[PDB]
């Protein structure tokens, strides 16, 4: 209950495959930069 | 002219009938010269474009200027090699195309000091060393494999005997094994005409070990002429430069551990006996590593027995295809 159960939870966590994306491997950086520039895409100033 | 064509056909006929005859002996080159670009060859279009550090195998007799030789490359055809006197003649032709070769410089000094060429401008001088263009080497290379640290001890001796076993078993009937119990690093050729020719002279070198070492050199030559490859179990030489300038010029095999951290524990696996000599065992290891890899012929840098076993197997397999 304590050790082996936590082994299963750890093994699935460590080896969880990324959800699809079809493996383009044409883009260079990705990582945090992919999401950060996307925020710059849809950025709307707050309106009073 | 009919004379040149007649000797062209006679040489071609001689080459054809000598294609299946035994090899006489081999020579050593130290200059990058091509024998296909020289117009003085008896047959044009069948020269040899061989660089330095190369093997040539001469079989038959032509003249005092040219010889019929073959390359140790695979597929190499029968070509013509210049004689040592011919190379000396063509060596003199190398620096004659220059503006000046002797003492009189051409620094805006024309018609003032004619300076006819004395004996200094010929090959008579510069005889302090006078390395010959050709050296006598065994037909096929003796196999000298150097231990990772130092031969004569348990850990090193275990390294070669395993390889000694495989070369004897897999290649039985075509490989001869010989052990050089005595020294082999005293192979000199330009020391004296005959140091210690007789054992009754009671000279310093006559009663020394040089006489037996000198006699061991030609035994390796004898094993080479009978077409079987030979190895050397020399227990004294531990560095490439120790047996590199000699007339043997053999194939050097390296067995090494990847890291000294592995070697020290491998030495520990033998027992307390090697702990006394462990200190001298380590300085003898890193010295060989500091030697450039290009000095060695083949490198066994890996770990497993079987893959290292096949590494030397295919290498001399090239050497057997190459010289056949």
């Amino acid at each position: 209950p304590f050790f082996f159960v936590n082994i299963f939870v750890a093994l699935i966590i460590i080896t969880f495959q990324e959800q699809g994306d079809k493996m383009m491997e044409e883009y260079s950086l990705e990582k945090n930069e992919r999401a950060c520039i996307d925020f710059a895409i849809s950025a709307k100033p707050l309106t009073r | 002219e009919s004379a040149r064509r007649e000797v062209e056909s006679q040489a071609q006929q001689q080459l054809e009938r000598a294609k299946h005859k035994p090899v006489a002996f081999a020579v050593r080159t130290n200059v990058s010269y091509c024998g296909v670009l020289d117009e003085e060859c008896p047959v044009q279009g069948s020269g040899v474009n061989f660089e330095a550090k190369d093997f040539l195998h001469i079989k038959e007799k032509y003249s005092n200027d040219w010889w019929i030789g073959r390359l140790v490359k695979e597929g190499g055809d029968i070509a013509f090699i210049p004689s040592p006197q011919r190379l000396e003649s063509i060596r003199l032709k190398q620096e004659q195309k220059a503006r000046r070769s002797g003492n009189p410089s051409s620094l805006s000094d024309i018609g003032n000091r004619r300076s006819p060429p004395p004996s200094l401008a010929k090959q008579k001088q510069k005889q302090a060393e006078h390395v010959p263009p050709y050296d006598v080497v065994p037909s096929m290379r003796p196999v000298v494999l150097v231990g990772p640290s130092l031969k004569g001890y348990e850990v090193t001796d275990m390294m070669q005997k395993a390889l000694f076993d495989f070369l004897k078993h897999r290649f039985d009937g075509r490989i001869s094994i010989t052990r050089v119990t005595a020294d082999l690093s005293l192979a000199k050729r330009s020391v004296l005409n005959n140091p210690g020719k007789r054992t009754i002279i009671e000279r310093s070198s006559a009663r020394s070990s040089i006489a037996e070492v000198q006699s061991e050199i030609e035994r390796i030559f004898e094993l080479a002429k009978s077409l079987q490859l030979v190895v050397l179990d020399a227990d004294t030489i531990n560095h490439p430069a120790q047996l590199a300038k000699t007339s043997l010029a053999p194939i050097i095999v390296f067995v090494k551990v990847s890291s000294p951290k592995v070697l020290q524990r491998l030495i520990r696996s033998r027992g307390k006996s090697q702990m006394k000599h462990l200190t001298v065992q380590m300085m003898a290891y890193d010295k060989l590593v500091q030697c450039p890899p290009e000095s060695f012929d083949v490198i066994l840098d890996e770990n497993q027995l079987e893959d290292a076993c096949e590494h030397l197997a295919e290498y001399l397999e090239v050497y057997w295809r190459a010289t056949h």
């Binding site: 044409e26 883009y27 260079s28 950086l29 945090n32 930069e33 992919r34 950060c36 520039i37 925020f39 710059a40 895409i41 950025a43 100033p45 707050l46 309106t47 009073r48 | -």
Partner: protein
């Protein structure tokens, strides 16, 4: 914060208020209220935002370079490499966002004209003038301390 400075929040702010802005903000995106002036100008020099004719800077264009300078995205150290990397970045976004309008791409990735007056150029000049003024001030002091003997 950006909407707070401009209550109307049209999307354009004077370049002068940017220097006051980045100090209020915390690092890494901001500079911090304790940031030295010289370090602040050094980041602005790498940020390289063009300035509009009304002396204002766009919200989206400013946001990109602050992301650009903080994550070191395709940042060359200078020269023609800047144009090559910007063109490579433009292609990647078009490959990732095919529906991105060209005006938005030119608004986010500004095409660099040599005539354009950038924020970096403005801060480069004042630092040079400050350095020249300080160098002249030191020279006048130098020729004075050496003359009192």
């Amino acid at each position: 914060v950006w909407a707070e400075y401009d209550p109307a929040a049209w999307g354009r702010m004077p370049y002068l208020d940017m220097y006051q802005m980045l100090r209020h903000m915390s690092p890494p995106l901001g500079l911090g209220k304790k940031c030295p002036a010289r370090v602040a100008y050094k980041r602005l020099l790498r940020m390289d935002l063009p300035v509009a004719d009304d002396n204002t800077v766009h919200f989206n264009s400013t946001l990109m370079a602050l992301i650009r300078t903080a994550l070191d995205i395709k940042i060359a150290k200078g020269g023609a490499d800047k144009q090559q990397m910007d063109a490579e970045l433009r292609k990647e976004m078009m490959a990732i966002w095919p529906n991105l309008s060209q005006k938005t791409l030119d608004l986010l990735v500004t095409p660099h004209k040599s005539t354009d007056l950038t924020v970096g150029k403005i801060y480069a000049a004042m630092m040079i003038m400050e350095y020249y003024r300080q160098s002249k001030a030191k020279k006048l002091q130098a020729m004075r301390e050496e003359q009192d003997r």
